[PDB]
Design a protein around this ligand. Structure first.
Ligand SMILES: [Cl-]
Ligand SMILES: [Cl-]
Length: 162
């Protein structure tokens, strides 16, 4: 359980519940742990979506909107260590341009980086200047294509509420 380790799980659960009722999509709260993104709380799909994000399990902090938001908002030194572990060169424009874009917008969007046909939209959860986690919606590209601005606004709204 993350009852004693996630200080604000009640608040997180309330935000994710609303977010799914606003978008009709799966939503999760992710936190960075070393080289990986841990899914701490997840709503679960009322459709039949079976993607790689599972509550209590982690993914490498590298691909997808959630990973890219956390990498963009954590300290540079930390971000560099992680990307170098995965064999990426953090100094390249393809990374630096993405992080600048993310910080300008306040969220990231990804498509099919993890699961073919599934997109991610994510925004950082901050405590002051410290990145603590991210709120994300994981949803079929079929639906994101019709609801992109709606999902972005609600994801931003969810993250800001925490
Ligand atoms: Cl993705
Ligand atoms: Cl569908």
């Amino acid at each position: 359980s993350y009852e004693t380790s996630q200080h604000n799980l009640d608040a997180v659960e309330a935000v994710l519940s609303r977010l799914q009722k606003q978008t009709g999509e799966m939503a999760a709260y992710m936190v960075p742990v070393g080289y990986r993104a841990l899914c701490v709380s997840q709503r679960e799909s009322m459709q039949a979506l079976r993607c790689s994000f599972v509550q209590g399990q982690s993914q490498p902090l590298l691909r997808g909107a959630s990973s890219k938001v956390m990498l963009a908002y954590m300290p540079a030194a930390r971000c560099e260590k992680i990307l170098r572990y995965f064999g990426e060169d953090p100094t390249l424009d393809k990374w630096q341009s993405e992080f600048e874009k993310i910080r300008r917008h306040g969220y990231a969007v990804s498509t099919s980086e993890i699961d073919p046909g599934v997109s991610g939209i994510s925004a950082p959860v901050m405590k002051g200047s410290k990145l603590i986690g991210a709120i994300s919606v994981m949803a079929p590209a079929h639906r994101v294509e019709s609801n992109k601005q709606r999902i972005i606004l609600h994801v931003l709204q969810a993250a800001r509420a925490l």
